[PDB]
Amino acid sequence: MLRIAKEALTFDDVLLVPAHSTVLPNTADLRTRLTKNIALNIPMVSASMDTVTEARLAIALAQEGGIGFIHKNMSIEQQAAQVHQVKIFESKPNACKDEQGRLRVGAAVGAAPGNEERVKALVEAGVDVLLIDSSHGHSEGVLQRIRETRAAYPHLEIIGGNVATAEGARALIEAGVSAVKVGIGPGSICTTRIVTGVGVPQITAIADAAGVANEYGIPVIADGGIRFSGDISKAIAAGASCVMVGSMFAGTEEAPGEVILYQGRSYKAYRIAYKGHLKEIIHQQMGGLRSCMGLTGSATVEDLRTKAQFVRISGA
Amino acid sequence: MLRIAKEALTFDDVLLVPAHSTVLPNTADLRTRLTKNIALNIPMVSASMDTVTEARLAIALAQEGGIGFIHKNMSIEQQAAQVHQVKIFESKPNACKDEQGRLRVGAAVGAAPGNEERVKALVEAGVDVLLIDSSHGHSEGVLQRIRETRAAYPHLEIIGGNVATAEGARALIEAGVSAVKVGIGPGSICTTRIVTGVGVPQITAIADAAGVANEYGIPVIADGGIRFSGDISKAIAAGASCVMVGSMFAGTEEAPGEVILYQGRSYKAYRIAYKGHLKEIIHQQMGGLRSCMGLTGSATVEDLRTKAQFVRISGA
Amino acid sequence: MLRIAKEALTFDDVLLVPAHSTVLPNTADLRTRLTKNIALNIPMVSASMDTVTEARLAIALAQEGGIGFIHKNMSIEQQAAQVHQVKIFESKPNACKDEQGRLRVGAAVGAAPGNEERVKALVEAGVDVLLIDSSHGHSEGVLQRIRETRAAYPHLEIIGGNVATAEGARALIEAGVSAVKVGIGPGSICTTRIVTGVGVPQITAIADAAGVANEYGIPVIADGGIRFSGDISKAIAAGASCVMVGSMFAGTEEAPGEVILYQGRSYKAYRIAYKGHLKEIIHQQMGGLRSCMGLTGSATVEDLRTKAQFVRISGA
Amino acid sequence: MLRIAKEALTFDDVLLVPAHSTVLPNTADLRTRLTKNIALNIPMVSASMDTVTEARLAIALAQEGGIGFIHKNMSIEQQAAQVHQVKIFESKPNACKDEQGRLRVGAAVGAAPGNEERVKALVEAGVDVLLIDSSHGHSEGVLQRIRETRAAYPHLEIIGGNVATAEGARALIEAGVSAVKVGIGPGSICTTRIVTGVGVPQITAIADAAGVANEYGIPVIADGGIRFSGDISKAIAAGASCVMVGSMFAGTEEAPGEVILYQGRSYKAYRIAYKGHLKEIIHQQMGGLRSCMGLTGSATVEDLRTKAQFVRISGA
Secondary structure, three states, rough: OEEEEEOOOHHHHHOOOOEEEOOOOOHHEEEEEEEEEEEEEEOEEEEEOOOOOOOHHHHHHHHHHEEEEEOOOOOHHHHHHHHHHHHHOOOOOOOOOOOOOOEEEEEEEEOOOOOOEEEEHHHHHOOOOEOOOOOOOOOOEEEEEEEHHHHHOOOEEEEEEEEHHHHHHHHHHOOOOOEEOOOOOOOOHHHHHHOEEEEEOHHHHHHHHHHHHHOOOOEEEEEOOOOHHHHHHHHHOOOOOOOEOOOOOOOOOOOEEEEEEEOOEEEEEHHHOOOHHHHHHHHHHHHHHHHHHHHOOEEHHHHHOOOOEEEEEEEO | OOOOOEEEHHHHHHEEHHHHHHOOOHHHHOOOOEEEOOOOOOOOEOOOOOOOEEEOHHHHHHHHEEHHHHEOOOOOHHHHHHHHHHHHHOOOOOOOOOOOOEEEEEEEEEEOOOOOOHHHHHHOOOOOOOEEEOOOOHHHHHHHHHHHHHHHHHEEEEEEEEEEOOOHHHHHHHHHEEEEEEOOOOOOOOOOHHHHOOOEEEEEEHHHHHHHHHHHHEEEEEOOOOOOOHHHHHOOOOOOOOEEOOOOOEEEEEOEEEEEEEEEEEEOOOOOOOOOHHHHHHHHHHHHHHHHHHHHHHEEEEHHHHOEEEEEEOOO | OEEEEEOOOOOOEEEEEEOOOOOHHHHOEOOOEEEOOEEEOOEEEOOOOOOOOOHHHHHHHHHHHEEEEOOOOOOOOHHHHHHHHHHHHOOOOOOOEOOOEEOOOEEEOOOOOOOHHHHHHHHHHOOEEEEOOOOOEEEHHHHHHHHHHHHHHHOOOOEEEEEHHHHHHHHHHHHOEEEEEOOOOOOOOHHHHHHHOOOOOOHHHHHHHHHHHEEEEEEEEEOOOOOOHHHHHHHHOOOOOOOEOOOOOOOOOOOOOOOEEEOOOOEEEOOOOOEHHHHHHEEEEEEEHHHHHHOOOOOOOHHHHHOOOOOEEOOO | OEEEEEEEHHHHHHHHOOOOOOHHHHEEEEEEEEEOOOOOOOOEEEOOOOOOHHHHHHHHHHHHHHHEEEEEOOOOHHHHHHHHHHEEEEEEEOOOOOOOOOOEEEEEEEOOOOOOOHHHHHHHHOOOEEOOOOOOOOOOHHHHHHHHHHHHOOEEEEEEEEEHHHHHHHHHHHHHHHEEOOOOOOOOHHHHHHHHOOOOHHOOOOOOOHHHHHHOOOOOOEOOOOOOHHHHHHHOOOOOOOOEEEEOOEEEOOOOOEEEEEOOOEEEOOOOOEEEHHHHHHHHHHHHHHHHHHHOOEEEEEHHHOOOOOOEEEEO
C-alpha cells in the first residue's frame, strides 16, 4: 500500500571490513578525480559557502592537494578576481595544479536564468571547474541551465548537483555534467528533512548515484552528512571519488572572517570557533583515511571505492 | 505464536524521495478535499478542542483556505451561534468558501445518544460539515450514531473517526461518512499507548485507511502525531488528503484564551506560549509543504498523495 | 555460525490493534484464571517480596479481586499465621474467594531441599496456592522439588517458575504445576541480563510459554518487565492469564513497612515513596486494561488473550 | 549496489537463552584453553598495556587461574626480568601453572622488524606464550613476522591478532599461530570506528573467527568491547575460549602505578580510580559467568562455547 522504493542507509548504519593488506598508512595513495578530466591529490574539496571558501582558503587547499570552490555571494568582478588570484599564485609537493602548472580552483554560480555574465567572467579568469549549485539538481530548470552552459562551453568541466538517486545522476549526466554532486537531506536531523520531509540517507544516495555514474566514467562527489574522518572513508567506499566539506574548514585561519577574542577564546566573525591552519585539519582527516586504507588493503582511492566491503550494523 | 498482523511505520521511519520536477515552491497547487463534496485551498483543518477552535480561529483559518471545527464544550445555542458567526462573516484570495460565497465551517458533536438536538441546531445554523468525534471510530455505538445521522441528514457532509485500520475505514464508509479521520495512538509516547497498549503508527494507519477509502473516492484526514511541517508532507504522501492539527494553533492570537503576561513572556490562559497570528504559522507550515512539492515534482496535492515515493530509514 | 534460536520481542516492540467493538470500558469482564482450578476477578497477583506482600496487602488485594503471595522471609509459624489471618478475615463485590466463601491467599516457598515442614504448615493453615519460586525454573532441582510436592499434595494448586521458553513451560507442566510463571531477565536493563548475559524479552517469553501451556489448559502468569498499565494489556494479549507485580504495590498503605516523613515527603521504611491505598492503584491499572478491552473489542480477558492482534513497531 | 558482506551483531544485540540445567553456579567448571597447548583455570587473560600488566599483576592473575601478558613498553632486559620474576614466584588452589609447577606468564612484542632480540630474551627467561600484537593482524607484514617467529621457535605458543573475520583467522592460522585474538573496532563508539570507519561488531567477529579456528582446534581470544560480566558469557557463547581485558584491571592494587589520594578519593597515577585487589574483581566477574552457566545448563566452558543459544533482540 505504502509506496516505499527501498530501505536507505546512512553512515552510522555501516562499517568497513578489515582485509588482507600490503598497504601501510604512509604508503596509501590519496589521488583521485574531481571530474572526468580533473585529478586531485587528496579527496577533499571545499564548499562554495561564504564562511568557507574565498581565494585564500582555495590557495591553501590546492596547495595540500584539494580544490576550493569560490562562493558566489559577491560581485562578478570580485568573484573573477578571486579566481584569478588563485591561478596566478606562485615545499608543497602535493599541490593540485593544472596542465600549466597553476593551482586549480573552482567557482560556484546559481542555476537561475541570468548568470551568463558571471560564468563568462569566471571562465575568462581561468577557472578550472564551474559548479552550478542548486538545492534540487533533478529540477528541470537546473538541468536546462546545465545543458545551456555545456553548449556554450563544450570543454568546461562542470559539476552539477545535488541529487540523491540513480535517475537524478543519470539526468545530470545527460544534461552534460563532468561530475555528479550528491546530497539531498543527507544529515540525520537537518532542516530539509524536518521542514520538507524529503531526504535520502547518504550512503545509499552515493551508491545509487555511483552505480549510474560509474558506467560513464563520471565521478561522484559526496556533499553532506560527514561528521568524522571515518565518514570520509565510508563515503568513498560507497562510490564517491571525493568529499565536499564546509563547516569542517569554516573557522580556519585561511577561511574568511576576522579572528576575534571573545570570553577568553578565539572565534571567526563576519561566530565560529577558531581552528588554526587548514592544513592541520587536512592532516588529521587524511590520517584517518590513510589508516582505513591500511586496514582495508586499499592501495588507492579507487580500490577503496570499488572493492572494500561493508558490514551492516544495528543501533545497539 | 504471537499474533502480529504486520509491521507498522511512523513518520520518523520514512523520508520522501526527490524526483524530476517542473514545480517550484511558489507554483505548487495546495488545493485538496476535506470531504467528498468539500474542497479546501490548503490541506489543514483545526481540531475541535476548546483551546484551539472557536469562531474567531475558524474565520481566520477559513480565510487562509482551511476549515475549522468548532468545539462542543459549550451549550447548543453557543455552538450554533458560533457556526452562524462564521457563515455570516464578510485581501483573502485563498479563502475557503461554500457555493454561496460564505466561509466554510465545521462543528463537532459526541457519539453518545442524545446529541440529536445539537446536530439539528448546528445544521440549521448552516454548518458545512459535522464531525462526530470519538476515541474509537470502530466502536459499534459510534458506527450506529453515524448511520442515524446520515439517515436523518442525507446531504450533510459527515466526518467520522478515529480509526487506524483498513477495516475501520471500511466500516465508517459503510456507516455513511463523507471522510475518514485517522489516528489511534498516533504519537510515539502518547497516553493511549502508555495506558492502554493500543496504537497504530500513523504512516501505516493512514496508508491502510486510504487504501480502502480511495476505492470509494472518500478522503482520509490525518489526525495526530504531526510535529513538523515535514510530517504534513509525509502524511499526505501516505494517502491523506489533509491534516488536522491542534496544539500547533493553540496559543495563536485567534485561538481562545486571553493573552497574559507571566515572567516576561506571553501566554494564553483559560497556560500555552503565545504564537502570534495564525496566518504566520500557516505560511511556515505550508512553506515546507511547498518545498517538498518542488523537490518531489508534485504539481498538486493529489500527485504527492498518490505518486511520490518514500524510502525506509533506520534509527541511526 | 552464531547459534541464534530466533528474534525475541519485548513490550515496547509491539502495540495492540484497535478492532470492531461492542465493549465499553465499564462492561469489560476482568475475570480470568490464576491456576487451573483458581479463578481471579482481576488479572493481578502480588509478588512474594517482603516489601510487597504480607497478610494485610494479601487481604486488600483479595478484596479487589486478585490474590497475594505471602513472602517466605519469616518463620514457618509466622508465615502460616499470616495465611490463616487472610483465610479467616471477614462493600467488596469483586472479592476473590474460595468455594467456602473465604478470601484466597497464596504463599511462597523456596526450591531448596528442606522446605517440607514449611509447605506442610502452609497447607494446614488453608493456603489456596503454593508458589515454589526460583530464579531458574528449568533447573532440574526445581523440577524435582515440584514433582515431590505434587506427589505429597495431589490436590494442591502449585505455581512453578520462572521460565522463558516453550521447553521450560513444558518441563514445569510435566513436573505437575497448575500454572507456569514466566520471566527470566524480562526487564530491559535488569541485573540478570547485565551480570549473566541471559534473558528473554517478555512478549516472546510469554507467547512461547503460552503456546505450550494452552494445549494443557494451564495458565501462564507474566512476572516482570511491566512498567505501565499498557504493558498489562500486552502481556495478556501475548498469552498470559494474569500478571504478577511487585514494586507497583510496594509503598502502598497496605504493603509492609511503616510510613515515615522524610524531607517533607512520605516514604515506607523497613525507603520507597508512599503510594496511598492499594485500591486506587488497582483502579488506575485496571482502568487502562478496560480501555484497551474497549478499543480491541475484547469482552473478556480470554478474548484479549487469544484473539487481539499486535503490530510490530520500530524504535523511531 | 552497495557492497555489504552481511549484517554484524554486537553484545547488546543478543541474549543467552535459559535451558534445562543440572549445573549450579558453584559447580560450573571454569577451565578452558588460552592456546592450543595452554590450559587456563578461568577464562580471563590481561592485556599487554602498561597500566594493566607487569609482573605483580601477572602473578596475582595467574594465582586466580588466568594469565597476564607483560607489556613491551620497557627495555628488553626489564621485560625479561619481569617474565622471570613471575616464573620463579613461589592457599591458591586455582593457580594457572605450567608442566613444571611454575606460574604461567605471557609477554607481548610488536610486529615490526627488529624485535628478534626481544623475543629471544623473553623465551630464554621462560615465557609460556608470546603475543605478537598489532592493530591489524591481516596485514602481510604481521603475518610475515609471525611466520618468522614460528620458524625460529617451532614449539613456542604464539598468539597473533587482531582480526575480525573468517579469512583473517585463517591467515593467522596458516602463519603458525597457536591462538587467534579477535577485535577490530569492537567497541560501539571507539576511536578506530570514528576515525577510520572500520570495525566489526564483536559477537559476529568472534563467531566468524571461531568458525574457522574450531576446524583446527585453535582457540579464539575475545579482545575488546566487554563492559559487563554478562558480555564475557556472550563472548564465550559466540565461540571465544577466553576474554582479554584491560581497563577492568587497571587501577587494581596489583596493576602498575602508585596509589595517590586526590580530593578525598583514591586513584592510581603513572589517573584511574583505585579498585582494590584484583581478586575481588575476578570473583564478581566470574560470579556472573557462573550464574550464566547455571541458567544455561553449561557444565563447562566448552558447553557454553559450543551449545548455548542466543536470542536476537531489538533496541527497544
